[PDB]
Amino acid sequence: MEYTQLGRIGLKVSRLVLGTMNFGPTTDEAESHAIMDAALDAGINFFDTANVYGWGENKGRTEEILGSWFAQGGDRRDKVVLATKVYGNMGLDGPAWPNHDKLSALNIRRSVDASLKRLGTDHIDLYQFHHVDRDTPWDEIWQAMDVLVRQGKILYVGSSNFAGWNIAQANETAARHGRLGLVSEQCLYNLCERRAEMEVVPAAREYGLGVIAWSPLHGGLLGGAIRKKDPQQREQIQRYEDLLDKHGLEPGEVALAWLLTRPGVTGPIVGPRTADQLASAVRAAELTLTDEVLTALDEIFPGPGPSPEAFAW
Amino acid sequence: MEYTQLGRIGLKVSRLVLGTMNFGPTTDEAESHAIMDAALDAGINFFDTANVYGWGENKGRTEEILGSWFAQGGDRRDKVVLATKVYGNMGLDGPAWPNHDKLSALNIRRSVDASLKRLGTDHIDLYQFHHVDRDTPWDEIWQAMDVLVRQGKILYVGSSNFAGWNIAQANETAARHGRLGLVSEQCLYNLCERRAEMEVVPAAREYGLGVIAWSPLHGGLLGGAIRKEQGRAADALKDPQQREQIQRYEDLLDKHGLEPGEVALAWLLTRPGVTGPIVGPRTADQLASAVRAAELTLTDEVLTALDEIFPGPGPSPEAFAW
Amino acid sequence: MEYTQLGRIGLKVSRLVLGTDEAESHAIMDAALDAGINFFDTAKGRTEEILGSWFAQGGDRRDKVVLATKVYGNAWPNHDKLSALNIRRSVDASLKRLGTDHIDLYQFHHVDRDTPWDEIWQAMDVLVRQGKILYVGSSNFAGWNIAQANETAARHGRLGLVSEQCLYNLCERRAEMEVVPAAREYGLGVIAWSPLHGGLLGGAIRKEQEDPQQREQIQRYEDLLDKHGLEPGEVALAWLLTRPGVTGPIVGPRTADQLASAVRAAELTLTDEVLTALDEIFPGPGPSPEAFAW
Amino acid sequence: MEYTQLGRIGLKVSRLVLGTMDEAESHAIMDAALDAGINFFDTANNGRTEEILGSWFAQGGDRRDKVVLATKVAWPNHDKLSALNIRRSVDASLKRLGTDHIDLYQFHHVDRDTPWDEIWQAMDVLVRQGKILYVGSSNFAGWNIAQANETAARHGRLGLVSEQCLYNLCERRAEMEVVPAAREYGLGVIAWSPLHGGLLGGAIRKEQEDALKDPQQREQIQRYEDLLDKHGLEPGEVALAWLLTRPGVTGPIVGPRTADQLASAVRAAELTLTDEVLTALDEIFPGPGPSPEAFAW
Amino acid sequence: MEYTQLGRIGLKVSRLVLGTMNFGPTTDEAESHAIMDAALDAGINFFDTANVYGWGENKGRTEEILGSWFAQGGDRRDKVVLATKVYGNMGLDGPAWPNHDKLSALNIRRSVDASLKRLGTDHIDLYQFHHVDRDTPWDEIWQAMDVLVRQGKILYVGSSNFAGWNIAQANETAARHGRLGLVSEQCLYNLCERRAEMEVVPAAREYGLGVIAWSPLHGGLLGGAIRKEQDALKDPQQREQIQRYEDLLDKHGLEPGEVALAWLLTRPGVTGPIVGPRTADQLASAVRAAELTLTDEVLTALDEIFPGPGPSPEAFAW
Amino acid sequence: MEYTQLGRIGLKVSRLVLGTMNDEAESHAIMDAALDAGINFFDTAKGRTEEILGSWFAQGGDRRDKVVLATKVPAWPNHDKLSALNIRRSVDASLKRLGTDHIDLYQFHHVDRDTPWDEIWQAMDVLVRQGKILYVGSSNFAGWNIAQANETAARHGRLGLVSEQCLYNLCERRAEMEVVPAAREYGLGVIAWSPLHGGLLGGAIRKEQLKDPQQREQIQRYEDLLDKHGLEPGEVALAWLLTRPGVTGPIVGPRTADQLASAVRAAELTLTDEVLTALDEIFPGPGPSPEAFAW
């Protein structure tokens, strides 16, 4: 397993982030404990979860499945860099009670409390904003986070679904008064959706943020998903699959291996449903995509490159 | 129910703010609870109380009623933006013991823990200064609030009855060292009394404060007092000059099919920078009359007619100079 | 002549501010100097060229006076108000006319809510560093504009406003709400503009030897000052000199009697009795919030 | 003529920006733009355009005093944004403009090799000598605007006041992060190439009466020209009127070289596109909205 | 009973600060409680003490007598501004074990918890430095005090026996990083010893500190010394100062201990003196001296018998 | 000639400071010899006393380049005190009398309790950045004035005061209380004015052929002790100061090559433990506050 610094900070993480999305809704508590044990022994120390994981009326179940994983002992909690999220509605799906979503100091305080409880731990290592909230200013947001830091309840703060200028505003506001700003951005990034390259990824590079990609198979589309509706992308997908057949490669492992070559990308979040899915993703980290394959991938999946070159000059 | 951000911050608050002066004094515990449950049903999520509410030897009784209300479970605490106040003398009425009123770090420490205890909750959402205190400098005041914030005892800090320059000084002072400044001002603002427009409301609008209007009926003087003539407003109607003012107001509203109470709240909702009035329902029926006042549309003829009965100074320096 | 520090700063000034054809202002300025009045204020260019013709007569004139002037406007874009663009041209045309290489107190004519304080202070600091300006003052501001302005300046070490020039007299006391308390908190001198309320306080009912509720105000005023032997224009000036935070009033005498009239007013000491009487004819609003709530 | 504040600052500009492309013709239009009330002058749609301005000022009549004058900044350090290239750039520019100060001194493009403490040193020196009042950007990313004004404000300096970006109906990707960042920081937004190089200027009816060889683009402009053929509007005016409806857009750069092109842009400033027309224009030329919703959620 | 803002801050205190150094050593616990109820009853809320008061093997005792006074209930703790101190050795007298005196953050941490436990209360209102420590820098000091502040264990920080430049340096350091600085200086200042007027009181006044004057009778020297003859100062320079003091006050029919207290109350910048009653009669004597009015004629006399130096540099150049 | 850094800063000055005399020609000759003895620190403790240095600089010979030039700032309002108005007018008048485009050490004459430090530092910062002055000093400050001034300068990044010129001699030592301790804390040089107390230390009684009630007795013990030791009164008054912690050195105003030569002999004279013990006996100090008046 390959390691790297989470951007600029002293945290050392695995280049695969174990996504726990399915633990609860699609994969059961027992086998999820098995999948997390497999990850640990394969060298993966960076686990990503979210309060809202569990879904519907079980929003929260994933944070409990990790909580009961830690409760078995074995230095499991001590070994894991535990990240979870705040922003999402923890009420019944739909228009939330005011202040029970977004990033007010109010929702941050009540969300961290609920998440620490389900997780059976006194601290989160990486507490990420699940989305930008344009109505909450950064002096408020950093007040909330800093309180959780001073009480030892969180260590680092990360972002997800931010614009590049949010990363800059956040970390300049925090640096002004002596606070560690964002250390990571969790952005949507894969071969089919590459527009985080325009501003999101260069911003995070300028300010020293880790970059972790979610939907790294783009909802499974890059996962060999023709094998038994718009024709254009169907064709993009068909040629991606033909190209990999000529080269003897699995579509799943290339989507992941390809993110692992992009500049500034710490690693994708892999969401395995079985252990064979974890295993398969671990081999993607040993895969070395040639310059022949990389070149012909960028032909089928063109990127925009940075702004303002993307759209102007 | 209309929602709005409370000034610049991430807090979303209903544009009606449930005041709680009456709970204890004029409404007993049981009915107070029933009205609060009704506010949540009507979407009001923003509750305003104060330590001194409760009167005389019974000051703090209002907070205890919200506390027993929270104790029934049901996400009552988790659902409401809880706001209360510090400044007031909680001793027997009259000249307070030194440091038992106003905004020293001493009074702030003692007031907050007694409020938290009476409210039976581990945090206040909006901790408001009840009045400007000119003897306490802002590095002391922000020291006191910042301790409360870092301990998780309070979230947001508001002012009530401040001057314009007090809001500015407070929030520049906070900003220098990275503190969230005041998030809201609670000013006396209604039709008959519009001098908050001179400097208070412009300052709060510059510094990104919500504006919460208290005494929105002017002591009931706008709630149809003269037709109910079939404390402040009592001997204020014994002004010949002034009782024609409230006369033209009640005559106008009769022509237009409108209720004097509801138009006082609805008007405040048209003023620029006003988050919403504080309503003081003593029954669920008067709550329900306030909720209708938040959905009324005040047409341009009415507002024209209102502004000429109730003249406003507008902002300084233009209000006394040019 | 009574002198005072201009608010918090080290600048000492007389408590009359000498305000506002050519040669009959030159003689009145020289005797204002003889009276000990060093605070000269241009409160549009002939007056500045006229003060400019004064300094060019040698003899310690630019070295003895505190020189104050204002920005222009009350138009073409950026030719009024307080942008860096107008500040720059306003000051450079003011230095031309005044015939001097620096202005002592450079004032804003009025509040410009569309121009941010980081812009304004940049433009003043360029002038302070080039020796073109020493001190900045405000005119017709709200109390919260003073706070915001001096707080903004102090963040980066600049000296903020040292003075606010507002409308303030017995007929109009509404600067006591917030303007003057802000000025007092931040240590600005308060300069009373129109101390006689356009001469309304200077004995106007009598000069009819030549609104019904507002002339009864002035009637009770003069009738009061008849029975106490006092001169009306002088009391209006002496009444401002007793208000806390007031540095002094702008006066522009052109005779030698009005100069002596104004000097007497700055020496006149009003008995407590008359102060009480004037208070009931011309009530004051108090500072906010107490003025309109509690 | 509609005026407005240039972002957060107290400078008032007309919503038409007078940009560029012999001197007599230039002078007359500049005199006529001033007659129409245009005060915002810029030397870009950076040689000879500057001296045509310097000799226009040389005619007196308060010309210099009436315009907000904006200009902008390969052997090493003869391009890009080192303090070295800025120092030589502005002095050359000052001499060619025949004036002792530029009102709005803009970067031509972001320089990712130059840090902002060096850029703001160089800008601040010029500020304190009085050579320069305001600073603005061209062709930045959203995240360069934030990094810039954040670094300026740490020490009291005025940040960027404007950003000149490629914005028109056909190319709307500045809406993702560029324009969002400038509204947050209070920068005027100056839309460069508001017709997309004439592509929006009735280019198909002028082909009878370069990007046109692509059928997908060709149909897009055909729908555009048909819609205004039914609505009574001139296409070159719509393209500017549309931009004037976008939040944070100060105005477009217009380069009229004749009175007839001038009355055409003034008229553009005064149109009111109906909600029907805006709705149709948005189905023809869709925008991406802001990040991250543009590509995630 | 007159009240005043403590310097520039919001805290209101009595112009008499109740000295407690006699509570325990000389006056007993039961009678120290009675003196303290009478001080409440007389309007005094400013109680001053120190961890050391008690002396010798009994250092800490005074703090305990306030604790058991607070444990009587009756809103005694809630009515009182509690001031204690840190600097003095709390262990066996003499050379202190290293860091068991002075103002390292290590000594600060251990002194506040031991004073909190003796005082029977979770917070001190005014934590004072008992003396300047030139060896501890102010980033160290304000760190330790700020920790106490943010834990809610202390409200205000004050000094005692500083120079003027120590006050300046501390309050400027605290302000850089937003912290409320010194709120009070407790200096030695009476008729015999006026040299605090040179720099201590001007600096204190510049920075908005209350000035609390300790040893206001100069160890009894101003407490009717010779008439009571029925420190040493058998030096004849001081007994003429003091003879002409007592005979002037007997020409005018006045109490020596009362004038010493009434005098300090007229000095500009002085919040008030610390009065140290041993009995409740001595408490009522001090209360009287606080509504005493000394004529502008007597003050001339005292000033030519106890000449002040005034402010530096004027005090020794021009 | 012994040198020393002026307090905390990189300026290296001679331990003797050439003070103000009172003839152009005769002042010029002292100054040229002062240069030859290695004294580089010139101060003007203003009218003719400044234009004489100016005629001196105009002779050339690297006289301005070798010299660290120091100078200072009822009256008409704002024609004394330290208002920004008066500083800009004083420095203009000084720069022109002095026939030079910069002052090295611009010093305040006296504390002014009515001008704030953000006003003063505004004025001094203007001159620094125009190259008109380099270093700021103070004279006749209290200790807390030094502390306040330099804390205010450091907030927004200015060099603070670099030196304090205080009254400090054997007879008057109350600057050891707070002013010299403050200057020592903030890294200022301490420049001693009136090192002989108006001449009282350079042999007042052995030249009788101001001050004489109580003070005569101690001046006799002084002169007697120095007779019995073979030391000169003036030279010792100056040499004593050079042993005092934080003291850069004393202002000397020699009006004759001899006096300059005597001042120089004072700077390399080494007082013994016994003389030092005896002088403190005759002229006690109060030590630092608070110990001086408390404990």
mmCIF file of C-alpha atoms in Angstrom, chain F residues 39-249:
data_model
loop_
_atom_site.group_PDB
_atom_site.id
_atom_site.type_symbol
_atom_site.label_atom_id
_atom_site.label_comp_id
_atom_site.label_asym_id
_atom_site.label_seq_id
_atom_site.Cartn_x
_atom_site.Cartn_y
_atom_site.Cartn_z
ATOM 1 C CA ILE F 39 34.184 60.689 18.643
ATOM 2 C CA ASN F 40 31.552 60.159 15.921
ATOM 3 C CA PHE F 41 28.378 60.930 17.919
ATOM 4 C CA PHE F 42 27.268 64.539 17.630
ATOM 5 C CA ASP F 43 24.252 66.040 19.464
ATOM 6 C CA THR F 44 22.813 69.571 19.656
ATOM 7 C CA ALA F 45 21.435 69.961 23.268
ATOM 8 C CA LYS F 46 18.657 75.095 18.791
ATOM 9 C CA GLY F 47 19.122 78.192 16.576
ATOM 10 C CA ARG F 48 22.780 79.085 16.079
ATOM 11 C CA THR F 49 23.876 75.806 17.631
ATOM 12 C CA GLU F 50 22.573 73.990 14.494
ATOM 13 C CA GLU F 51 23.782 76.416 11.819
ATOM 14 C CA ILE F 52 27.310 76.071 13.202
ATOM 15 C CA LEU F 53 27.373 72.338 12.461
ATOM 16 C CA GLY F 54 25.947 73.296 9.075
ATOM 17 C CA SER F 55 28.806 75.610 8.166
ATOM 18 C CA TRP F 56 30.979 72.729 9.385
ATOM 19 C CA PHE F 57 29.422 70.143 7.044
ATOM 20 C CA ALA F 58 29.865 72.561 4.084
ATOM 21 C CA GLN F 59 33.665 72.442 4.386
ATOM 22 C CA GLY F 60 33.376 68.862 3.112
ATOM 23 C CA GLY F 61 36.070 66.341 3.923
ATOM 24 C CA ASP F 62 33.556 63.589 4.702
ATOM 25 C CA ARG F 63 32.435 65.403 7.845
ATOM 26 C CA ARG F 64 28.710 64.635 7.415
ATOM 27 C CA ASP F 65 29.554 61.093 6.255
ATOM 28 C CA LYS F 66 31.588 60.363 9.393
ATOM 29 C CA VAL F 67 29.103 61.826 11.854
ATOM 30 C CA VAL F 68 25.969 60.377 13.413
ATOM 31 C CA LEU F 69 23.917 63.592 13.613
ATOM 32 C CA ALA F 70 21.446 63.955 16.498
ATOM 33 C CA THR F 71 19.181 66.913 17.283
ATOM 34 C CA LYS F 72 15.922 67.808 19.051
ATOM 35 C CA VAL F 73 12.500 69.295 18.439
ATOM 36 C CA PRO F 74 4.444 81.344 26.589
ATOM 37 C CA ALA F 75 4.705 79.658 23.211
ATOM 38 C CA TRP F 76 2.342 80.045 20.290
ATOM 39 C CA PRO F 77 -0.001 77.018 20.148
ATOM 40 C CA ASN F 78 1.648 74.074 18.385
ATOM 41 C CA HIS F 79 5.050 75.847 18.261
ATOM 42 C CA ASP F 80 6.281 73.668 21.103
ATOM 43 C CA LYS F 81 5.067 70.212 22.252
ATOM 44 C CA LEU F 82 5.030 67.120 20.006
ATOM 45 C CA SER F 83 1.928 67.581 17.822
ATOM 46 C CA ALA F 84 2.444 66.263 14.297
ATOM 47 C CA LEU F 85 2.195 69.902 13.223
ATOM 48 C CA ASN F 86 5.204 70.975 15.306
ATOM 49 C CA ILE F 87 7.397 67.989 14.369
ATOM 50 C CA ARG F 88 7.085 68.698 10.635
ATOM 51 C CA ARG F 89 7.872 72.380 11.142
ATOM 52 C CA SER F 90 10.792 71.709 13.494
ATOM 53 C CA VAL F 91 12.422 69.143 11.227
ATOM 54 C CA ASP F 92 12.090 71.454 8.210
ATOM 55 C CA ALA F 93 13.734 74.258 10.159
ATOM 56 C CA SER F 94 16.433 71.885 11.456
ATOM 57 C CA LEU F 95 17.236 70.303 8.088
ATOM 58 C CA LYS F 96 17.830 73.760 6.590
ATOM 59 C CA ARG F 97 19.874 75.243 9.434
ATOM 60 C CA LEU F 98 21.974 72.075 9.375
ATOM 61 C CA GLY F 99 22.768 72.162 5.664
ATOM 62 C CA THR F 100 22.031 68.452 5.332
ATOM 63 C CA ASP F 101 19.250 66.321 3.882
ATOM 64 C CA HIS F 102 18.907 63.831 6.744
ATOM 65 C CA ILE F 103 19.175 63.673 10.538
ATOM 66 C CA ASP F 104 20.495 60.411 11.942
ATOM 67 C CA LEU F 105 18.869 60.656 15.390
ATOM 68 C CA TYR F 106 15.807 62.878 15.721
ATOM 69 C CA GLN F 107 15.011 63.254 19.452
ATOM 70 C CA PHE F 108 12.039 64.592 21.396
ATOM 71 C CA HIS F 109 12.920 67.369 23.892
ATOM 72 C CA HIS F 110 10.569 66.245 26.664
ATOM 73 C CA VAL F 111 7.587 64.004 27.209
ATOM 74 C CA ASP F 112 4.350 65.638 26.015
ATOM 75 C CA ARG F 113 1.427 64.082 27.864
ATOM 76 C CA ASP F 114 -1.169 65.498 25.462
ATOM 77 C CA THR F 115 -0.010 63.906 22.183
ATOM 78 C CA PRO F 116 -0.826 60.232 21.506
ATOM 79 C CA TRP F 117 1.789 57.868 20.150
ATOM 80 C CA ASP F 118 -0.124 56.979 17.012
ATOM 81 C CA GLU F 119 -0.033 60.717 16.239
ATOM 82 C CA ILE F 120 3.716 60.950 17.003
ATOM 83 C CA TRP F 121 4.655 57.773 15.190
ATOM 84 C CA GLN F 122 2.607 58.941 12.184
ATOM 85 C CA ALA F 123 4.761 62.072 11.977
ATOM 86 C CA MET F 124 8.064 60.239 12.553
ATOM 87 C CA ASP F 125 7.159 57.506 10.045
ATOM 88 C CA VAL F 126 6.569 60.129 7.341
ATOM 89 C CA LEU F 127 10.115 61.435 7.791
ATOM 90 C CA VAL F 128 11.781 58.001 7.941
ATOM 91 C CA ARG F 129 10.178 56.922 4.661
ATOM 92 C CA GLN F 130 11.104 60.238 2.986
ATOM 93 C CA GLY F 131 14.739 59.584 4.110
ATOM 94 C CA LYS F 132 14.589 62.746 6.243
ATOM 95 C CA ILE F 133 15.446 60.889 9.471
ATOM 96 C CA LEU F 134 16.581 57.376 10.362
ATOM 97 C CA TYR F 135 16.381 56.821 14.150
ATOM 98 C CA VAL F 136 14.141 58.322 16.838
ATOM 99 C CA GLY F 137 15.165 58.973 20.435
ATOM 100 C CA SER F 138 13.664 60.618 23.482
ATOM 101 C CA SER F 139 14.795 63.014 26.175
ATOM 102 C CA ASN F 140 13.208 63.619 29.576
ATOM 103 C CA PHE F 141 10.792 60.664 29.406
ATOM 104 C CA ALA F 142 9.443 58.648 32.279
ATOM 105 C CA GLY F 143 10.049 54.897 32.130
ATOM 106 C CA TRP F 144 6.455 54.121 31.180
ATOM 107 C CA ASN F 145 6.731 56.674 28.346
ATOM 108 C CA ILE F 146 9.575 54.599 26.842
ATOM 109 C CA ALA F 147 7.553 51.406 27.280
ATOM 110 C CA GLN F 148 4.358 52.884 25.815
ATOM 111 C CA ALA F 149 6.154 54.544 22.877
ATOM 112 C CA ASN F 150 7.975 51.414 21.741
ATOM 113 C CA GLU F 151 5.094 48.978 22.247
ATOM 114 C CA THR F 152 3.042 51.255 20.008
ATOM 115 C CA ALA F 153 5.729 51.394 17.325
ATOM 116 C CA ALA F 154 6.204 47.587 17.305
ATOM 117 C CA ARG F 155 2.489 46.774 16.733
ATOM 118 C CA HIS F 156 2.634 48.078 13.158
ATOM 119 C CA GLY F 157 6.304 47.352 12.652
ATOM 120 C CA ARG F 158 8.352 50.506 13.300
ATOM 121 C CA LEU F 159 11.683 50.701 15.005
ATOM 122 C CA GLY F 160 10.872 52.264 18.373
ATOM 123 C CA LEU F 161 12.989 54.719 20.306
ATOM 124 C CA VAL F 162 16.701 53.888 20.173
ATOM 125 C CA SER F 163 17.916 55.997 23.083
ATOM 126 C CA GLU F 164 16.797 58.081 26.037
ATOM 127 C CA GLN F 165 18.644 61.256 27.086
ATOM 128 C CA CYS F 166 18.068 61.554 30.852
ATOM 129 C CA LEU F 167 19.494 63.635 33.687
ATOM 130 C CA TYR F 168 21.937 61.193 35.282
ATOM 131 C CA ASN F 169 24.933 62.106 37.418
ATOM 132 C CA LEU F 170 26.417 61.278 40.805
ATOM 133 C CA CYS F 171 24.171 63.832 42.570
ATOM 134 C CA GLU F 172 20.895 62.923 40.861
ATOM 135 C CA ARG F 173 20.400 59.182 40.441
ATOM 136 C CA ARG F 174 16.615 58.877 40.586
ATOM 137 C CA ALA F 175 16.748 57.674 36.951
ATOM 138 C CA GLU F 176 17.895 54.281 38.257
ATOM 139 C CA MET F 177 14.377 53.884 39.671
ATOM 140 C CA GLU F 178 12.377 53.386 36.485
ATOM 141 C CA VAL F 179 13.667 55.298 33.432
ATOM 142 C CA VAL F 180 17.016 53.488 33.178
ATOM 143 C CA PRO F 181 15.346 50.106 33.964
ATOM 144 C CA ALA F 182 12.727 50.725 31.246
ATOM 145 C CA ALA F 183 15.348 51.780 28.676
ATOM 146 C CA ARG F 184 17.286 48.645 29.609
ATOM 147 C CA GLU F 185 14.216 46.462 29.061
ATOM 148 C CA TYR F 186 13.425 47.943 25.641
ATOM 149 C CA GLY F 187 16.970 48.054 24.281
ATOM 150 C CA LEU F 188 17.516 51.828 24.253
ATOM 151 C CA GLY F 189 20.842 53.512 24.737
ATOM 152 C CA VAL F 190 20.858 55.772 27.813
ATOM 153 C CA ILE F 191 22.487 59.144 27.098
ATOM 154 C CA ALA F 192 23.475 61.055 30.226
ATOM 155 C CA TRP F 193 22.774 64.781 30.206
ATOM 156 C CA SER F 194 24.350 67.145 32.738
ATOM 157 C CA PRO F 195 26.926 64.529 33.856
ATOM 158 C CA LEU F 196 28.518 67.060 36.226
ATOM 159 C CA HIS F 197 25.165 68.337 37.591
ATOM 160 C CA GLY F 198 25.737 71.814 36.233
ATOM 161 C CA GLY F 199 29.429 71.713 37.051
ATOM 162 C CA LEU F 200 28.913 70.571 40.625
ATOM 163 C CA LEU F 201 31.082 67.489 40.072
ATOM 164 C CA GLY F 202 34.068 69.011 38.288
ATOM 165 C CA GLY F 203 35.612 70.822 41.251
ATOM 166 C CA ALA F 204 33.080 73.405 42.455
ATOM 167 C CA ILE F 205 34.669 74.136 45.835
ATOM 168 C CA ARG F 206 38.314 74.146 44.695
ATOM 169 C CA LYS F 207 37.502 76.983 42.301
ATOM 170 C CA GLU F 208 35.701 79.424 44.612
ATOM 171 C CA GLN F 209 38.939 81.309 45.432
ATOM 172 C CA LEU F 210 23.946 77.573 42.673
ATOM 173 C CA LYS F 211 23.875 74.938 45.378
ATOM 174 C CA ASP F 212 25.375 75.140 48.888
ATOM 175 C CA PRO F 213 23.375 74.216 52.037
ATOM 176 C CA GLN F 214 23.131 70.466 52.647
ATOM 177 C CA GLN F 215 24.794 69.657 49.299
ATOM 178 C CA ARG F 216 28.157 71.266 50.045
ATOM 179 C CA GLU F 217 29.058 68.698 52.661
ATOM 180 C CA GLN F 218 28.879 65.854 50.153
ATOM 181 C CA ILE F 219 30.743 67.773 47.448
ATOM 182 C CA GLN F 220 33.617 68.213 49.931
ATOM 183 C CA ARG F 221 33.815 64.479 50.694
ATOM 184 C CA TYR F 222 33.890 64.046 46.912
ATOM 185 C CA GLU F 223 36.718 66.525 46.312
ATOM 186 C CA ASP F 224 38.649 65.345 49.390
ATOM 187 C CA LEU F 225 38.337 61.686 48.379
ATOM 188 C CA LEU F 226 39.658 62.508 44.913
ATOM 189 C CA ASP F 227 42.561 64.577 46.250
ATOM 190 C CA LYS F 228 43.562 61.641 48.504
ATOM 191 C CA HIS F 229 43.322 59.492 45.354
ATOM 192 C CA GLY F 230 44.944 61.656 42.682
ATOM 193 C CA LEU F 231 41.904 61.655 40.410
ATOM 194 C CA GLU F 232 40.294 64.644 38.755
ATOM 195 C CA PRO F 233 36.723 65.624 39.750
ATOM 196 C CA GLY F 234 35.310 66.150 36.250
ATOM 197 C CA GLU F 235 36.983 63.088 34.741
ATOM 198 C CA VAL F 236 35.586 60.891 37.541
ATOM 199 C CA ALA F 237 32.039 62.271 37.299
ATOM 200 C CA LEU F 238 32.129 61.138 33.650
ATOM 201 C CA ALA F 239 33.910 57.819 34.294
ATOM 202 C CA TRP F 240 31.472 56.843 37.044
ATOM 203 C CA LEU F 241 28.623 57.030 34.528
ATOM 204 C CA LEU F 242 30.497 54.709 32.141
ATOM 205 C CA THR F 243 30.307 51.945 34.770
ATOM 206 C CA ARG F 244 26.569 52.215 35.141
ATOM 207 C CA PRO F 245 24.535 49.431 33.480
ATOM 208 C CA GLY F 246 22.810 50.518 30.274
ATOM 209 C CA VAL F 247 24.593 53.881 30.008
ATOM 210 C CA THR F 248 25.933 54.502 26.510
ATOM 211 C CA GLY F 249 27.900 57.481 27.775
#
